[PDB]
Ligand binder design. Structure first.
Ligand SMILES: CCCCCCCCCO[C@@H]1O[C@H](CO)[C@@H](O)[C@H](O)[C@H]1O
Ligand SMILES: CCCCCCCCCO[C@@H]1O[C@H](CO)[C@@H](O)[C@H](O)[C@H]1O
Ligand SMILES: CCCCCCCCCO[C@@H]1O[C@H](CO)[C@@H](O)[C@H](O)[C@H]1O
Ligand SMILES: Cc1ncc(Cc2cccc(CO)c2)c(N)n1
Length: 176
């Protein structure tokens, strides 16, 4: 389907275009608002669409050199697997009105948690040389990635709650 392919490409391109915005709170702590179009894609079109949009967004980050890349496996883990994992929100898609808020927040929560889980593992393995003085690798990664995860969920929550209320039909795909 052609409408699908193009929804996917548009939301992935929109994620990258959003990932161009300064979002650093402090050091490597970030508010990852660029996740939002992918989560929106996932919730509206289901898992597969989401994984694919996540995959596309990730490649875009890399090929334009906006990804932080220390190595093949690290970039694999953080710019393929991690953005793809947002598609997990697709398991929470609603196909029939009226749209409930609960599966939107439950899906959003779980998908960001999953992405940041992958960043947390990456922090431990590839990013510890950056840990603040006195901090082991695990504590530092939980701090950076736990906090960033939460702020991201928070922003994702604010924006999708607004969307649920003002434009609920964004989340329900129908023909016609
Ligand atoms: C090809 C392997 C890596 C490159 C990926 C393609 C880069 C362009 C993103 O995809 C394309 O986006 C265009 C703009 O939105 C659309 O014209 C088209 O519908 C869509 O398919
Ligand atoms: C919840 C998101 C808001 C975070 C914005 C903070 C940016 C970096 C941390 O700031 C610091 O905070 C310290 C403790 O308050 C101050 O003593 C210090 O002067 C200030 O540099
Ligand atoms: C860390 C990986 C997490 C994977 C867990 C995902 C399983 C949840 C799927 O259940 C779903 O509940 C939704 C609302 O609760 C409904 O919209 C949907 O129809 C139903 O299928
Ligand atoms: C400790 C630590 N520092 C930096 C990174 C790279 C990275 C890339 C994308 C998103 C995030 C979210 O914090 C982080 C990491 N995974 N762990």
């Amino acid at each position: 389907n052609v409408r699908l392919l193009t929804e996917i490409a548009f939301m992935a391109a929109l994620a990258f275009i959003i990932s161009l915005i300064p979002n650093t709170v402090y050091g490597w702590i970030i508010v990852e608002i660029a996740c939002i179009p992918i989560l929106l894609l996932s919730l509206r079109r289901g898992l597969t669409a989401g994984l694919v949009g996540g995959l596309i967004w990730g490649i875009l980050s890399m090929i334009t050199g906006h990804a932080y890349i220390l190595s093949l496996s690290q970039a694999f883990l953080e710019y393929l697997v991690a953005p793809v994992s947002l598609g997990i929100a697709g398991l929470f898609r609603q196909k029939t009105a009226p749209l409930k808020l609960a599966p939107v927040l439950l899906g959003t929560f779980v998908a960001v948690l999953l992405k940041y889980f992958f960043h947390f593992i990456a922090g431990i393995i590839f990013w510890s040389q950056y840990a603040w003085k006195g901090w082991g690798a695990v504590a530092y990664s939980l701090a950076v990635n736990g906090i960033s995860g939460i702020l991201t969920a928070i922003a994702a929550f604010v924006i999708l709650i607004i969307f649920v209320k003002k434009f609920p039909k964004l989340f329900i795909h129908s023909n016609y």
